[PDB]
Amino acid sequence: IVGGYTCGANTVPYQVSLNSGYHFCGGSLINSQWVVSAAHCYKSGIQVRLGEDNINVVEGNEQFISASKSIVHPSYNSNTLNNDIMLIKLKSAASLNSRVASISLPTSCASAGTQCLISGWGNTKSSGTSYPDVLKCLKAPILSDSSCKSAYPGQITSNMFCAGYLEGGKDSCQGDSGGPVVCSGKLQGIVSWGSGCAQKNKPGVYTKVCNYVSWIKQTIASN
Ligand SMILES: COc1cccc(CN)c1
Numbered sequence: 280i281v282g283g284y285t286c287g288a289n290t291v292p293y294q295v296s297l298n299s300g301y302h303f304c305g306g307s308l309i310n311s312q313w314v315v316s317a318a319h320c321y322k323s324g325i326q327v328r329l330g331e332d333n334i335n336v337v338e339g340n341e342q343f344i345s346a347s348k349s350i351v352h353p354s355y356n357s358n359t360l361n362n363d364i365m366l367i368k369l370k371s372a373a374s375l376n377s378r379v380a381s382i383s384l385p386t387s388c389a390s391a392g393t394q395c396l397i398s399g400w401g402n403t404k405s406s407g408t409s410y411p412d413v414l415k416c417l418k419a420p421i422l423s424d425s426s427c428k429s430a431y432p433g434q435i436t437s438n439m440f441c442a443g444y445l446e447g448g449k450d451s452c453q454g455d456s457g458g459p460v461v462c463s464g465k466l467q468g469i470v471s472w473g474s475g476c477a478q479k480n481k482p483g484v485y486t487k488v489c490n491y492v493s494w495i496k497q498t499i500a501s502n
């Protein structure tokens with residue numbers, strides 16, 4: 280997260296870190312056994328880390344649970360990043376509490392102008408590289424489909440939305456990938472892509488989660 284703020288330990292209780300020897304992506308806990316992330320975060324040997332603030336220090340609220348399976352969306356295209364969503368099942372159910380909690384799926388799609396919370400352990404620099412140890416947060420509005428399409432000609436599908444600031448300075452970045460965009464207590468987006476970070480007229484692009492609720496529910500019900 281570039282130009283954000285320190286969230287505060289365990290203030291974003293649905294935020295997970297995906298770890299394969301190191302943090303490589305964010306995710307969102309959607310029930311005791313399932314995490315939603317980006318399909319571009321797919322790899323084998325994933326351990327889901329819940330209750331994290333400082334990802335380099337065991338602070339006492341963590342649960343570390345290995346993934347038993349990953350399910351990338353059947354229509355995910357890695358070139359265009361269309362359908363950039365993946366489900367991860369935990370080998371055992373997380374113990375839910377005030378600091379490890381699921382986030383609700385949307386019942387409706389959020390509109391342009393809606394204020395949301397984007398969070399993660401990604402790069403905090405727009406030019407350099409600096410990775411934080413503690414969770415960073417950014418309040419950001421959803422941008423209109425037209426401004427999103429104008430920012431990225433030929434690249435925005437019906438399964439994507441832009442959020443952030445056309446002036447730059449405040450954005451998600453590398454390592455925030457797969458993490459949440461939450462608006463009014465619903466998971467509306469997944470950190471998906473962009474051109475660099477916090478650059479003028481190049482806002483973050485997010486997977487439009489409301490399009491996938493049926494798939495998520497069906498998949499969970501049979502797996
Ligand atoms: C350039 O790599 C990125 C990864 C995740 C999110 C974004 C959006 N600035 C960019």
Ligand SMILES: [Ca+2]
Binds near residue numbers: 332
């Ligand atoms: Ca920790």
